[PDB]
Design a protein around this ligand. Structure first.
Ligand SMILES: OC[C@H]1O[C@H](O)[C@@H](O)[C@@H](O)[C@@H]1O
Ligand SMILES: OC[C@H]1O[C@H](O)[C@@H](O)[C@@H](O)[C@@H]1O
Ligand SMILES: [Cl-]
Ligand SMILES: [Cl-]
Ligand SMILES: [Cl-]
Ligand SMILES: [Cl-]
Ligand SMILES: [Cl-]
Ligand SMILES: [Cl-]
Ligand SMILES: [Cl-]
Ligand SMILES: [Cl-]
Lengths: 345, 345
């Protein structure tokens, strides 16, 4: 009988260090990222089919259908990530015999949101197959596989932090070294600290970023072409990620906001398009309204912004942001990583 | 040294039965409500003061200051709920001796959202005092106190369901009887059911409702003046709340959507202003886009709508709602009730 599986994986806020996890920097100097998963998800669904076909459906409702063939599916530029996950699973776990199924995805945030959805989507597709095939893949293995599939098989450039947040969940401080070596440090944050942090964070969706590819290219060029000042901006991004991690472990909110301010200055100095006049206007208005610090989540150039605001100024900040283009929301963290469940069989 | 306490309490989605928990109906026939707390909060903060004064600050930033007097504060129509909570605590737990403090509130949703914020705000103010004074008030006692303060001391009409959701948290099926007797039934929903439900729910904020008072007045008049058909609509609201509860416990999503459709029809028939042409247009568009059921959370007339959509139509629904006036969000449930923490002393 037909099997139906669903999997979900949480999206993430990049709190600090983002950009240091990308190849040239992470391989040369070692990267640090502090991130935390939130209550918005990417999803994948597998439905086994009673016809000899394979169908792929994407979040923006592109759809491809193929006949059941004993060769890997071609990565032709349409739904490459879906096909690459399918190819890997059929080759490695099903002895190369095609499985008739429909693989679909959807997501609580669109592309370019600064919430890590591209890689989170790959993780959740892998997780659905883990559940379908009953695979003993541990969390490190799932995150590493997602990296391989996206960055190598599909050749899409980027870092490592999103694969780990989507898989592990929670607040994590990650260390990135050469030869694909990553250490995930789960942060066991005190309950009062988590509550205080949620009470002090405001999220603001500014619109779609089209800058991620350019920023990552620029940051990689900084290192390769030895751009001294821009490399030093990246060293600053790294330093402040460690300062922020220690601030959260110590419940030191003064140090937390200071590190976010320094981090944001460094991040903007690392690549030209991280911020722009539009983002700066919103940032300036938020600070005037009483926010103490803020930043763009993800590479930069648009997507979600996050602000730290003392509770007595929170409603004023929310009102102020209402006057700008974009959507305000609260910030609610999740402790669980990717999960799967069955609906049929 | 100065003490700082914060408390938070989750807001709630009224899944079924709302309106049957209000006095004339609940006292005469018994009410049923099924509700669930979500990841948006009301907050209260108490700061002890070093000057002989008391200050109250509201979510919309009204502010009152008074000198320290050994008489109850007058409920003059400005910040009555703040003053009434303060009055009760000073009289019952501090032998009538004034305490110098600032009591402030803020909230993740504005007034008229259909998320139960008015009563949730009272609960969270009580919880801050529970923490400040180290009171042994259990959950039933906190919810009952919040009812008394809001409905009796401040004379504001309404039901009982919000006090209980804010205090207890989670998915609850509540039974309301005469003489203020309430039974809270926590629903121990299977993990797959919760995940499936979140994957199938879409929230849509339509704007502020100004209809709550009118709807509740009308529903109360139905009973008092023996309006036969409108009373029978309310009996239907009640019946479908029980059907929906059993559907969730049995993981029966077909029965869940059928009960929501019948519930919504009954709810609209119980009071003239529950829906309107604007809400009906949005509802109609959501159904055409693929939603299977939907309703307004809270009394009606505006505020949050919720839609049940099969996962293969979810992104289409989200796109469609984008074309209407209001804000789309995912739906994420919380299991915890009201909580407090300390920042100073
Ligand atoms: O560049 C910021 C950020 O962008 C994407 O989300 C990924 O490539 C991450 O690995 C990286 O940290
Ligand atoms: O009338 C619907 C709803 O409105 C408010 O939230 C309260 O008065 C509740 O007790 C009631 O169930
Ligand atoms: Cl970052
Ligand atoms: Cl994203
Ligand atoms: Cl991102
Ligand atoms: Cl980032
Ligand atoms: Cl209801
Ligand atoms: Cl509300
Ligand atoms: Cl309400
Ligand atoms: Cl309701």
């Amino acid at each position: 009988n037909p099997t139906i599986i669903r999997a979900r994986a949480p999206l993430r806020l990049g709190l600090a260090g983002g950009g240091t996890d990308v190849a040239p920097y992470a391989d040369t100097f070692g990267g640090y990222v502090l991130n935390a998963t939130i209550d918005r998800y990417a999803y994948a669904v597998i439905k086994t089919l009673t016809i000899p076909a394979v169908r792929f459906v994407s979040t923006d409702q592109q759809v491809e259908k193929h006949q059941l063939i004993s060769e890997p599916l071609e990565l032709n530029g349409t739904l490459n990530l879906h096909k690459a996950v399918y190819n890997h699973m059929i080759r490695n776990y099903n002895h190369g015999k095609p499985i008739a199924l429909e693989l679909s995805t959807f997501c609580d945030a669109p592309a370019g949101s600064g919430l890590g959805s591209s890689s989170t989507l790959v993780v959740v597709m892998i997780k659905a197959f883990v559940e379908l095939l009953n695979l003993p893949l541990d969390d490190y293995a799932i995150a590493q596989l997602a990296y391989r599939i996206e960055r190598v098989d599909c050749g899409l450039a980027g870092g490592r932090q999103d694969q780990y947040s989507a898989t592990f969940g929670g607040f994590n401080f990650m260390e990135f070294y050469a030869a694909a070596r990553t250490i995930v440090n789960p942060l066991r944050i005190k309950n009062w600290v988590l509550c205080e942090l949620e009470a002090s964070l405001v999220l603001f969706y500014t619109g779609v970023s089209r800058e991620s590819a350019k920023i990552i290219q620029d940051q990689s060029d900084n290192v390769v072409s030895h751009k001294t000042a821009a490399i030093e901006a990246m060293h600053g991004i790294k330093r402040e990620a460690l300062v922020m991690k220690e601030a959260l472990l110590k419940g030191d909110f003064k140090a937390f906001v200071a590190s976010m301010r320094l981090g944001w200055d460094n991040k903007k100095n690392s690549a030209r398009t991280v911020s722009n006049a539009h983002i700066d206007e919103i940032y300036d208005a938020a600070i005037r309204a009483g926010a103490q610090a803020g930043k763009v989540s993800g590479a930069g150039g648009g997507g979600f912004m996050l602000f730290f605001v003392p509770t007595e100024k929170r409603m004023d900040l929310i009102r102020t942001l209402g006057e700008y283009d974009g959507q305000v929301s609260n910030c609610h963290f999740t402790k669980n990583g990717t999960q799967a469940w069955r609906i049929a069989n």
